[PDB]
Amino acid sequence: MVKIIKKPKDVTALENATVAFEVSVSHDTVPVKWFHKSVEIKPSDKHRLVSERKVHKLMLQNISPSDAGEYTAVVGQLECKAKLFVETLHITKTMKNIEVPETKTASFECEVSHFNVPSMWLKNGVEIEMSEKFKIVVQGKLHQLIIMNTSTEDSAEYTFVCGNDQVSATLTVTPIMITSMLKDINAEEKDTITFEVTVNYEGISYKWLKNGVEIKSTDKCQMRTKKLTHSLNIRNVHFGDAADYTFVAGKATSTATLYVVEA
């Protein structure tokens, strides 16, 4: 006269979750057994068997992928079955190897299987910390690493760790090259002059030096960019302006001299 009333249902859960299967019967104090892979389940640190009047539960704690599969409750000669599906954290979109000119920004992105995966980024196997240099971003299932102001030292293999999965890609930081170098300028007192250089990449950072000292942007000394050309325009030149000028971008430099003929 014992009847199964409510049968166990499939469970889908993340690895490391605690889950349960439940069978209910028509009578109090009916003994039950549970099976997985054709072996009877015993109480353990992983498995808890709880009977409460008509309700019988199998609880599985801290599940691993090996716990996946079909579980059977046996009540007399009556049986019922349900399955556990264990979702694991994994990569769903990989990262791209990239080449980035020095001084420019590099970025890596991947996509993962689940929300709320913690950020974990490595550079050559060593954990990276968020800083002004490294921007670490999560946007739902999208994970991004932004590397500012790249230099040779940033060329490396970068890895995102996602549970027991990981994905890697390489950054190669490429050298700025000067395709048209500075030329000397031979000027007269009160002239306005313009030094010009052309480089191979747009969007690079640079500075200008006067006898090795960084020049301040002023009305007199204007520094501008047009496409791949960078200029230093000096108004109303005098003897004090006669000097060696250097354009610097990344590891690339070009130097020329301004001559100013007086009076």
Numbering used by the authors: 3 to 265
From the paper:
Evidence accumulated over the past two decades has identified titin as a main coordinator of cardiac muscle homeostasis, and its dysfunction through genetic mutation as an important factor in cardiomyopathy. For this, we examined the unique mSNP T2850I in the I-band domain of titin I10, as a paradigm of an alteration in a general component of the titin chain. Domain I10 does not support specific interactions or have any known specialized roles, so it does not constitute an a priori sensitive locus of the chain. In previous studies, we have shown that the T2580I mSNP destabilizes the affected immunoglobulin (Ig) domain in titin, I10, and speculated that this instability increases the vulnerability of titin to proteolysis in situ potentially leading to myocardial damage.
Residue T2850 is located at the C-terminal loop region of the Ig fold. To study whether this region is involved in interactions with the next Ig domain packed serially along the chain and, thus, whether the T2850I exchange influences the Ig-tandem architecture of titin, we determined the crystal structure of I9–I11 (comprising I10 in its poly-domain context) to 1.53 Å resolution. Three molecular copies were obtained in two space groups that agreed in showing I9–I11 in an extended conformation. Such extended arrangements are common in titin Ig-tandems. In I9–I11, the component domains follow a regular arrangement, where domains display relative torsion angles of 45°–68° and are connected by short, two-residue sequences (TL and PI, respectively). In each Ig-pair, the domain interface is consistently formed by the A'B β-turn of the N-terminal domain slotting between the BC and FG loops of the C-terminal domain. Here, domains interact directly through a limited number of contacts (section S2). Both I9–I10 and I10–I11 interfaces consist of a central hydrophobic residue contributed by the linker sequence (TL; PI), flanked by two polar interactions between loop residues from the neighbouring domains (inset). Residue T2850 is buried within the I10–I11 interface (burial fraction of side chain is 0.79 as calculated with FoldX). Here, T2850 preserves its intradomain hydrogen bonds (to T2897 and E2849) observed in the isolated I10 structure and, in addition, hydrogen bonds with S2952 from the BC loop of I11. This suggests that the exchange of the T2850 residue will cause a local alteration of the conformational dynamics of the titin chain.
